[PDB]
Design a protein around this ligand. Structure first.
Ligand SMILES: [Fe+3]
Ligand SMILES: [Fe+3]
Lengths: 143, 143
């Protein structure tokens, strides 16, 4: 059974994964308004993946005996200053999500919640791999 | 090309479909907290379908030359007074969404936007069919 503090942190993170999904969809609305279908398609796939991650948090919280409480989702930005600007914002957001998950990892270690440490490690690795992909796109577009 | 008024209404409706998806997911969190897996599974599938509907609005808006602006999503209720209460709330929400779409239908007729009338008619039929399914579940649970 999860402690209340870890359940709160996981529930907070689930709502952060939903906002991440929503932000990427918003980036797609910007790319699609400019006619960058291919970049918009990449953002829509990332929005789908973040939602899938959110539902993995969902099912894990219920497996460990907690429940989910859904919070308001803030309005994301809807415009950026070009392609590179949007992907730099995505990279910055991914680094924020990685830091968020790393903070839960430290809390789980403190309460010796080894199942939560194992659960979260998959998401750190997927985030760094997503950061690497965005860095590759930025590198490709250089100058 | 869509008029600004119809584009605004479709964009408003897209955000209403996202909130609908979010409300059904919230109903699933309530059912799952009580251990009603089967009812929670039904709500998660409805949440997925509403999101699919939202993305059909998304792609239609861009086909007709508009863009999408994503708005804040309000926090849904997270608790109901039993199974019947949750499904009555779903029925009431579906009737609200049907009325919303019917109002766009009238606006599209007024501007003789026959493509939008055709686009929307599929969603009215799917909503009435969803209302029928919720009424059947309510009928099944009677007394
Ligand atoms: Fe993620
Ligand atoms: Fe719908």
């Amino acid at each position: 059974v999860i402690s209340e503090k870890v359940r709160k942190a996981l529930n907070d993170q689930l709502n952060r994964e939903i906002y991440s999904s929503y932000l990427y969809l918003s980036m797609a609305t910007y790319f699609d308004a400019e006619g960058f279908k291919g970049f918009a398609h990449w953002m829509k796939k990332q929005a789908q993946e973040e939602l899938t991650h959110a539902m993995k948090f969902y099912e894990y919280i219920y497996e460990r005996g907690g429940r989910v409480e859904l919070e308001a989702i803030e309005k994301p930005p809807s415009n950026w200053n070009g392609i590179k600007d949007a992907f730099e914002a995505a990279l910055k957001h991914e680094e924020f999500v990685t830091q968020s998950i790393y903070n839960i990892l430290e809390l789980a270690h403190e309460e010796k919640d080894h199942a939560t440490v194992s659960f979260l490690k998959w998401f750190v690795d997927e985030q760094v791999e997503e950061e690497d992909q965005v860095r590759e796109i930025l590198d490709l577009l250089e100058k």
